[PDB]
Structure 1
Amino acid sequence: NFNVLFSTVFPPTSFGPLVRKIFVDGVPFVVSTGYHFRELGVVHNQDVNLHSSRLSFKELLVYAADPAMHAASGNLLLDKRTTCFSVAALTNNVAFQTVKPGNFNKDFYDFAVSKGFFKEGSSVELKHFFFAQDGNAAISDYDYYRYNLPTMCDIRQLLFVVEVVDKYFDCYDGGCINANQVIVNNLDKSAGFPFNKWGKARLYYDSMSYEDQDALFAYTKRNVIPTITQMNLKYAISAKNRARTVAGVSICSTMTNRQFHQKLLKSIAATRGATVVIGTSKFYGGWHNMLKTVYSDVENPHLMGWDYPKCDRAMPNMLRIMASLVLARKHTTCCSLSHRFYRLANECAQVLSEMVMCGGSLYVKPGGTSSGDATTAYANSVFNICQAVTANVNALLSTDGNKIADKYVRNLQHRLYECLYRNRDVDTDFVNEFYAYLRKHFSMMILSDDAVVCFNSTYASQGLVASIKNFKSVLYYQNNVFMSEAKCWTETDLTKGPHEFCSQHTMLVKQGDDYVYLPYPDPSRILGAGCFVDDIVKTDGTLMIERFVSLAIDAYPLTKHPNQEYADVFHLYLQYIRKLHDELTGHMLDMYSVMLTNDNTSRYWEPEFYEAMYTPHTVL
């Protein structure tokens, strides 16, 4: 906290990797043997050898991921398009990347029009398209890191909020695992820079044996390895016309972050009935179970949701450090005290402030999160819980204590002030008491910066529980953003669920004998997915009929909506599926002579196959 304030005086060219000259068989290299953080000060590597013989495979991998050689063997660059610090240009040309439009499925559009759709004055219309971008879009989108400013925190209050958050994250287990227990799916994805010139992640997960991976992982508990992050543009459907960009992290960072965090990440995504709902599905009655869990037994229930403007470009560094420290608290037996600090330093040097490669040039990332590391959603959930806790603390500590009728709450406020500003060490009994109070009067359900809260209403009116105004104030003074209350909702009737959670609305329908909650999407999104695609994937439905089956699975609960076009969407999808099947069979029987059969294929255009996906019985 003090280093953050003091680092704003010193010049910005004295931060980052520290390099020196080493000799390998009489030839000189330039490698990084330390780091200078704005928050953590000066860090020196522990195992550095100047004179050495011919190097091995993992040394080659480490030296090929360091930005030192790439920056030192490049040209100077002065870029006036952005205000962020610039390092070097790797080539003699600047690369401009564009985004192409979508492909039009005319047959589906004609079929939909021939059934009374897209008429004037209708309540269902297309507002999801593929937007195109011009040459200078990647740099324009990268220039949004100017909203990240150095922020000092109230340390005596953060040191209590972190205890409450750790109480929230208490029902799991974690630790370190060996290289043979790591689970990877889709090994056919990119490996980052400069490793994308020779293959995908399969090549590097096959060429490296198990003890090589173990030695590489054990190397990062005594040294710091800075890497390079590549920025890519997305090609997907959306409702707004701004460019979207994701970050491609290097393989040397992901390979070790998996071994560090995967056990805890898998343990979190396997628990039901907790605050974090990552891993729970919405089919087979999952949505109803989540909604019933979040309602708990609150006394005067209302519902509330909020929004984070520029969530990843504006999150201060201190909260990211806090999230990493909270996640790394499960290593009390497998790791020492220096190993944990060096792991934290490696994480900070790789995914918090490092060189990014936009276009064909190297830039310096000021701060924030790089969406695309191995621990994105869980860290976002920790950050969301931290913000909710500090909002509750600020709401309770800023109330006239002479007007609180209940004496228990008055004593709680007195003890809260004493534990914040008059106590130096942790007091577990009051932490447990405050955690119980929060869980009784303020219930949460969190999924990576999306949240729904069921709170006591009279307590919030009297000021003993956080409100929207408290969230606005906390965001203003701790996140450097303004949160307009036009993107937040409030629901005073519990028979209708949250107004929006994970882009889905909620309706209470009668199925069987009882009443359950079902989610339904926006009809415009489903129709836009039907009509606008990437080529070959559609514009010929017979080649892929399984797209429309999934799209009709997503659009089933629209048949219980009081509005009439909403069910017509599902019926139109069923008729299109039947038409595509008939087209395929006849269109194949005609020129060729192969005769097709309709055995157990009619199930796809009858509603009973889709009705079974929202009824609690858990198949496959």
Structure 2
Amino acid sequence: AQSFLNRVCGVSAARLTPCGTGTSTDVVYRAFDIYNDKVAGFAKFLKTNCCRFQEKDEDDNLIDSYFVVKRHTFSNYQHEETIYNLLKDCPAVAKHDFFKFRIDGDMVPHISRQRLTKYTMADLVYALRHFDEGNCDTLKEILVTYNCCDDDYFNKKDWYDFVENPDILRVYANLGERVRQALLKTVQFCDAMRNAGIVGVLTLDNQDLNGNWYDFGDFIQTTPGSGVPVVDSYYSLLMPILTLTRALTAESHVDTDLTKPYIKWDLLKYDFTEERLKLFDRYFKYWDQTYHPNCVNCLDDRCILHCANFNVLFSTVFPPTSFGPLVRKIFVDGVPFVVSTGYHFRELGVVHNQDVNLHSSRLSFKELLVYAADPAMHAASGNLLLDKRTTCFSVAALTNNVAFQTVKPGNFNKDFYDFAVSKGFFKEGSSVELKHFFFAQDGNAAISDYDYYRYNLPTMCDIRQLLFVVEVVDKYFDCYDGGCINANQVIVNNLDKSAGFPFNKWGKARLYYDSMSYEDQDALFAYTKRNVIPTITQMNLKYAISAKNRARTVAGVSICSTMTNRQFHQKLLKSIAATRGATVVIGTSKFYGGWHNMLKTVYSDVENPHLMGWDYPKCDRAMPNMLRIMASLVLARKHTTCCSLSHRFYRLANECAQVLSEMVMCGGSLYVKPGGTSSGDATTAYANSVFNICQAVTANVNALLSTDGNKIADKYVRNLQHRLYECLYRNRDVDTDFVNEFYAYLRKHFSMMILSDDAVVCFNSTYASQGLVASIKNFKSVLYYQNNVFMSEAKCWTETDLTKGPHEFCSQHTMLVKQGDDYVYLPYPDPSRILGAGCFVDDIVKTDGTLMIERFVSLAIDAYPLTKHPNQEYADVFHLYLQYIRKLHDELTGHMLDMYSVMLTNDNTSRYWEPEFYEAMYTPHT
């Protein structure tokens, strides 16, 4: 065995420690991207049969250089030798030795690869994509080995969290240039293969973390000059790591080296199409599918997503000041304006308006509305701003003074509190205690909640998997009907809301909805189909009761965007809200037996059912732009008859320009929104539901493809996995048969109930145990590598007993009670929530009970199901509310008789302090 160790070294003049035993082998768990006629997927297999000898430095200091010797069969040894003699000249190819060593009496052929790292790139991608907080040794070793951090950095806890420990982004970004050099070396390898006429599939597991390629088992030889390096799974799997590690940060420096200063781009330059094509040619030369830098030229939704992925990657290399509205000077009646005539989206490239009017004569009401909404004139006239309180880009300060907006403490209803305490409440050691309050905020509240939009990062998706997931997710919206509607058919719920900035200076939404006729609204909607209208979304500060001290803000979008998005999603979404028994349970009440029906629909014939749930930590402020664009695209799938592709693209451009990356007016100053979603647009809850379903389907895909494949003892599921790999990384066009089959499989074994960012899942526990459907960890991994968010155990729950119902859904607990020879599920709230609603109120008038008796009737309706709870105090909550309602009615009658001496007690009010009126609200007869 010592003679062997002296021929593995050969003549390279190294020195080897037999890390792997010389003539014996080495066995470990390593991630592979495998696809045979038997097995498929991207899973951690058990590598074996290799001997890995480590190398010592001049000083006796071990380095991460390993000689990997392998035993091969003569027939594959000859083939690999003759396929390596052709690629031997490429710099991005690890050396090989190809010797024959005698074992027993047979000259066994050995292949020795020289100076490979410990881990390959497949290990890095797998570790960063299937991330388990309790199992990270293979990632910690990678990070420490390449001086990304120190071994003591992991003593800190939450070190992996993107929110609790935002410094982890720097640690990951220390891997950027290694990944970039790997990309350059794979491009070199592809060029060598093409020039030598070698045909083969490039996989991540054949490239170590220095970029070298070393395995030629399944390559074949053709005529020189015509080789076909098949890099689809390679790049598609590698894509998320490229933005997680910020691999292209070296492209922001002169000469593309990190030591020289940044590039000082021309300030007036906005069209980076040439640079985008240069980057694509430099790093993705052999990516077959065509790339459109400007998504105006894309062919359909599946081509918009594909090109916007690359635009997301490449827009991190360009100055932040070049993205946004493209302004131009136009003369109206001889007066020069400055109006937006285009846009530069970080994902969609450059878009130019088609109806730009130069040298006009007059501005109609529609034209004034359009020009008074875009930030062109507002920002071009305000003074410069440098806001050091936030990392978000600051555009301008419209006024001469900054506005600081506070939040008030809240009002105390002392009569209710005294009554409750007289009824034996709020004593020491009581299961029910006040936990919901009105919290106050100092001057820096809205600007402090914007620093939470700071959590949105450029995320590049695995585009092939994203396309398949989109095709599958679109089947959850097949029972609905949608399209464009006229202004006559738009239903506005409340017309007494604000119209946004600057339209809130002159009136509410009613003023504008009754000022401009239906013809003007139709004209504006048609205008938005071939032009982009940027708008400003105000940042409003909420005033509500909550259990934690966070200054929650919402987005007051303008009125133009609201009108033009209603004329699309009003008809798209009324059907979603009017449908019963679907996965999305928006529009379904919890009264009159609705909750029971929803749960029984969720439990729909699942075999070994367990319940799971979750809630995204920062849903709106951490949602990647790719998935928001996807949510907008699948909602527009209903416009196949009323809109052409150009109209659909311009509607997407409008949505992105006013609810994805708009300009927000926070305290009299304009800021640029990094991304995420604006909670307060026409499609908040429905877009959130689409995003939730997409994340769930992605989790299931990853769970099914990361399974071994040889261990699955069910033939149908094994074939399903084998074809799921094909339909992602070997099919360019959607296969409807398998999309239907996978949708049916998910519905059978993974039954969802979605309401915005809230979700409940009934899943086959046996399959989830065997790895054949998504567990609660396959969902945390997806959030980590595709949402830049770590989801902790405080946000997810599981239930092995489904006679208890979900632990929480929409802040409602479930209880299996009896009402009339039937066991039904009833929702009850947190008693502290109801008691806090009773004790603390918004206005000072609400602290007078006799004026607000319906206010307590609603709370009693909400709190009735607590009467069935085994805990006595919970029932005492409802009884307290009933007795207080009776007391308020008595006081009101007394006041009326004393002041206005006429009695109006009547008899219809008596039903309010009785339990029947509230019993009838949870019985299935309406």
RMSD after superposition: 1.0
- Does 2:866 align with 1:566? no
**Residue equivalent to 1:557:** 865
Give unpaired runs (5+ residues) of structure 2: 1-308
- Could you tell me how far apart the structure 1 residues matched to 2:543 and 2:615 are? 25
Deviation at 1:323, TM superposition (A): 0.6
Deviations, residues 509-551 of structure 1 (Å, cap 9, x unaligned): 1110111110101111111100111234422111111111111
The answer as to whether partners of 2:537 and 2:662 remain within 8 angstroms in 1 is yes
**Residue equivalent to 1:467:** 775
Task: Within 5 Å, give how 1:540-555 maps onto structure 2.
Answer: 540-555=848-863
Deviations, residues 183-230 of structure 1 (Å, cap 9, x unaligned): 011101100000111111111111101111111111111111101010
Q: Which moved more, 1:244-253 or 1:141-150?
A: 141-150
Give unpaired runs (5+ residues) of structure 1: none
Q: Which moved more, 1:115-124 or 1:482-491?
A: 482-491
Deviation at 1:45, TM superposition (A): 0.9
Decide which structure has the larger Cα Rg and report it: 2
Secondary structure (helix, strand or coil) at the match of 2:328 reads: strand
Secondary structure (helix, strand or coil) at the match of 1:454 reads: strand
Q: Which moved more, 1:530-539 or 1:246-255?
A: 530-539
Deviation at 1:117, TM superposition (A): 1.1
- Does 2:471 align with 1:156? no
- Could you tell me how far apart the structure 1 residues matched to 2:345 and 2:788 are? 22
2:566 to 254, 258, 269: 258
- Could you tell me how far apart the structure 2 residues matched to 1:147 and 1:505 are? 31
Task: Within 5 Å, give how 1:184-583 maps onto structure 2.
Answer: 184-583=492-891
- Could you tell me how far apart the structure 2 residues matched to 1:376 and 1:604 are? 36
- Does 2:470 align with 1:165? no
Deviation at 1:487, TM superposition (A): 2.4
Deviation at 1:6, TM superposition (A): 1.1
Deviations, residues 72-92 of structure 1 (Å, cap 9, x unaligned): 111111111111111111111
Deviation at 1:592, TM superposition (A): 3.6
- Could you tell me how far apart the structure 2 residues matched to 1:29 and 1:93 are? 26
2:316 to 1, 5, 8: 8
Deviation at 1:396, TM superposition (A): 0.5
- Could you tell me how far apart the structure 2 residues matched to 1:170 and 1:216 are? 30
Deviations, residues 318-349 of structure 1 (Å, cap 9, x unaligned): 10111111000111110111111111111110
Secondary structure (helix, strand or coil) at the match of 2:620 reads: coil
Deviation at 1:307, TM superposition (A): 2.4
Runs of 4+ in 1 over 3 A off after TM superposition: none
Secondary structure (helix, strand or coil) at the match of 1:542 reads: coil
Secondary structure (helix, strand or coil) at the match of 1:601 reads: helix
Q: Taking structure 1 as reference, are residues 401 and 553 closer, same or farther at Cα in structure 2, changes over 3 Å only?
A: same
**Residue equivalent to 2:242:** none
Deviation at 1:261, TM superposition (A): 1.3
- Could you tell me how far apart the structure 2 residues matched to 1:185 and 1:413 are? 47
Q: Taking structure 1 as reference, are residues 252 and 591 closer, same or farther at Cα in structure 2, changes over 3 Å only?
A: closer
Deviation at 1:7, TM superposition (A): 1.1
- Could you tell me how far apart the structure 2 residues matched to 1:527 and 1:511 are? 26
Secondary structure (helix, strand or coil) at the match of 1:9 reads: coil
Q: What is the TM-score of this pair, normalised by structure 2?
A: 0.66
Secondary structure (helix, strand or coil) at the match of 1:305 reads: strand
Deviation at 1:143, TM superposition (A): 1.2
Deviation at 1:593, TM superposition (A): 2.1
Q: Which moved more, 1:591-600 or 1:63-72?
A: 591-600
- Could you tell me how far apart the structure 2 residues matched to 1:338 and 1:449 are? 31
The answer as to whether partners of 2:617 and 2:795 remain within 8 angstroms in 1 is no
- Does 2:420 align with 1:109? no
- Could you tell me how far apart the structure 2 residues matched to 1:545 and 1:223 are? 51
- Could you tell me how far apart the structure 2 residues matched to 1:573 and 1:341 are? 54
Deviations, residues 456-496 of structure 1 (Å, cap 9, x unaligned): 01111111111111111111111111111232111111110
- Could you tell me how far apart the structure 2 residues matched to 1:263 and 1:50 are? 35
Deviation at 1:147, TM superposition (A): 1.1
Secondary structure (helix, strand or coil) at the match of 2:575 reads: helix
How many pairs were matched up? 618
- Could you tell me how far apart the structure 1 residues matched to 2:900 and 2:641 are? 68
Deviations, residues 40-83 of structure 1 (Å, cap 9, x unaligned): 11111111121111221111111111111111111111111111
Q: Taking structure 1 as reference, are residues 407 and 340 closer, same or farther at Cα in structure 2, changes over 3 Å only?
A: same
Q: Which moved more, 1:558-567 or 1:535-544?
A: 535-544
Deviation at 1:310, TM superposition (A): 1.2
- Could you tell me how far apart the structure 1 residues matched to 2:421 and 2:830 are? 19
Deviation at 1:29, TM superposition (A): 1.0
Deviation at 1:613, TM superposition (A): 0.6
Secondary structure (helix, strand or coil) at the match of 2:847 reads: coil
Deviation at 1:18, TM superposition (A): 0.9
The answer as to whether partners of 2:616 and 2:795 remain within 8 angstroms in 1 is no
- Could you tell me how far apart the structure 2 residues matched to 1:538 and 1:228 are? 34
- Could you tell me how far apart the structure 1 residues matched to 2:390 and 2:796 are? 32
- Could you tell me how far apart the structure 2 residues matched to 1:597 and 1:195 are? 46
The answer as to whether partners of 2:483 and 2:571 remain within 8 angstroms in 1 is yes
- Could you tell me how far apart the structure 2 residues matched to 1:434 and 1:599 are? 59
- Could you tell me how far apart the structure 2 residues matched to 1:24 and 1:487 are? 56
- Could you tell me how far apart the structure 2 residues matched to 1:355 and 1:494 are? 47
- Could you tell me how far apart the structure 2 residues matched to 1:17 and 1:601 are? 59
Deviation at 1:501, TM superposition (A): 0.5
Deviation at 1:276, TM superposition (A): 0.4
- Could you tell me how far apart the structure 2 residues matched to 1:116 and 1:43 are? 66
- Could you tell me how far apart the structure 1 residues matched to 2:906 and 2:516 are? 49
Secondary structure (helix, strand or coil) at the match of 1:541 reads: coil
- Could you tell me how far apart the structure 1 residues matched to 2:782 and 2:469 are? 13
Deviation at 1:590, TM superposition (A): 2.3
Deviations, residues 361-394 of structure 1 (Å, cap 9, x unaligned): 1111110000000001111001000000010000
The answer as to whether partners of 2:555 and 2:680 remain within 8 angstroms in 1 is yes
- Could you tell me how far apart the structure 2 residues matched to 1:168 and 1:192 are? 34
Deviations, residues 405-447 of structure 1 (Å, cap 9, x unaligned): 1111111111111111111111111111111111001110000
Secondary structure (helix, strand or coil) at the match of 2:850 reads: helix
Deviation at 1:599, TM superposition (A): 2.1
Deviation at 1:591, TM superposition (A): 4.0
Secondary structure (helix, strand or coil) at the match of 2:338 reads: strand
Deviation at 1:21, TM superposition (A): 1.0
Deviations, residues 551-597 of structure 1 (Å, cap 9, x unaligned): 11111111111111111111111111111111111222124422334
Question: How much identity, in percent, do the aligned residues show?
Answer: 100
Deviation at 1:313, TM superposition (A): 0.8
Deviation at 1:24, TM superposition (A): 1.1
Secondary structure (helix, strand or coil) at the match of 1:569 reads: helix
Deviation at 1:601, TM superposition (A): 1.9
Deviation at 1:96, TM superposition (A): 0.6
Secondary structure (helix, strand or coil) at the match of 2:512 reads: helix
Q: Taking structure 1 as reference, are residues 588 and 462 closer, same or farther at Cα in structure 2, changes over 3 Å only?
A: same
Deviations, residues 264-291 of structure 1 (Å, cap 9, x unaligned): 1001101111100000001000001011
Deviation at 1:120, TM superposition (A): 1.1
- Could you tell me how far apart the structure 2 residues matched to 1:312 and 1:535 are? 29
The answer as to whether partners of 2:663 and 2:672 remain within 8 angstroms in 1 is yes
Secondary structure (helix, strand or coil) at the match of 2:846 reads: coil
The answer as to whether partners of 2:530 and 2:647 remain within 8 angstroms in 1 is yes
Q: Which moved more, 1:328-337 or 1:478-487?
A: 478-487
Secondary structure (helix, strand or coil) at the match of 1:213 reads: helix
Q: What is the TM-score of this pair, normalised by structure 1?
A: 0.99
Secondary structure (helix, strand or coil) at the match of 1:232 reads: strand
- Could you tell me how far apart the structure 2 residues matched to 1:296 and 1:248 are? 40
